[PDB]
């Protein structure tokens, strides 16, 4: 009763990168609770929101959301790749995004 959440909390780790070159169009998301690429395959295509604050109350509220989705699975340990409409601003490296269950197959 005290809980209401219908998402899985994850962290925004980093951009997709080489050593010394980063590609800001693809972000890496660490979904908390996932350990392998199989069972990271469950969350593919699910929506992600990044909810943050501002000071300009636009459209009736002060909190804002950057939407995106999970696209594929990253290397060997349950990290996934994500693409957003406007990319994540690289000050959120180590910040909580929320992975919804909106396109579901269950």
């Amino acid at each position: 009763a005290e809980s209401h959440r219908l998402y899985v909390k994850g962290k925004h780790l980093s951009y997709q990168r080489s050593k010394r070159v980063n590609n800001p169009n693809v972000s890496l998301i660490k979904i908390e609770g996932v350990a392998t690429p199989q069972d990271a395959q469950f969350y593919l295509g699910k929506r992600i929101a990044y909810v943050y604050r501002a000071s300009k109350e636009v459209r009736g509220s002060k909190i804002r959301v950057m939407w995106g989705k999970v696209t594929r699975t990253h290397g060997n340990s349950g990290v996934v790749r994500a693409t957003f409409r406007n990319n994540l601003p690289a000050k959120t490296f180590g910040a909580s995004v929320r992975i919804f269950l909106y396109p579901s197959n269950i």
């Binding site: 962290k11 780790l13 660490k30 908390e32 490296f93 180590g94 910040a95 909580s96």
Partner: protein, 197 residues
């Protein structure tokens, strides 16, 4: 999953603990590392003392107060280890090292909190039985730390209160378990047991 993670740093290896801390604190986790004077480090004590006296040589020639600052506390030796694994010259690494607090002994905020153990850094699980190792408190005292006796006088004073808290809690759990068996036979428990519970 907790907001703040308190790591009881007894019997942990230095650079194997520091890598896990420097990855978690960059992922965004607030970590305090308590009881840092009981950290282990592989290699024999004279080997690690010769490595620290090799570190003591490297100071700026023309003005020594600019050079590498050789901190002598065990918490600051572990902090040097973690800061070598964080990109501490940028805003991201500077903000990641502010999620870290390292203490020798257990301060009174974290006296009454649950401590965790990192198993991929434990000396017991990682070193071969028979290898020699070094304790960071003895190494710090040998290289010039001053408060080994103070955090040992303040430690057993904490351990007395903890071991007299644990006896009261143990008697509480024995009084709970002597009366919780009166309900384990009934229909609610025989229905709960089919569900695994």
């Amino acid at each position: 999953s907790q907001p703040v993670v308190v790591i009881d740093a007894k019997d942990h290896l230095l650079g194997r603990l520091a890598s896990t801390i420097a990855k978690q604190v960059l992922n965004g986790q607030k970590i305090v590392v308590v009881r840092a004077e009981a950290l282990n480090i592989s290699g024999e004590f004279f080997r690690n003392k010769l490595k620290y006296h090799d570190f003591l040589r490297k100071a700026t020639a023309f003005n020594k107060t600019r050079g590498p600052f050789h901190f002598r506390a065990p918490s600051r030796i572990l902090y040097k280890a973690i800061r070598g694994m964080v990109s501490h010259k940028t805003a991201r690494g500077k903000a990641a090292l502010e999620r870290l607090k390292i203490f020798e002994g257990i301060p009174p905020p974290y006296d009454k909190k649950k401590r965790v153990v990192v198993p991929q850094a434990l000396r017991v699980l990682r070193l071969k039985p028979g290898r020699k190792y070094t304790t960071l408190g003895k190494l710090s005292t040998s290289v010039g730390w001053k408060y080994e006796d103070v955090v040992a006088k303040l430690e057993d004073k904490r351990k007395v209160r903890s071991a007299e808290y644990y006896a009261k809690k143990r008697a509480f759990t024995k009084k709970v378990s002597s009366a919780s068996a009166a309900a384990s036979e009934s229909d609610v428990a025989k229905q709960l047991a089919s569900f695994g519970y």
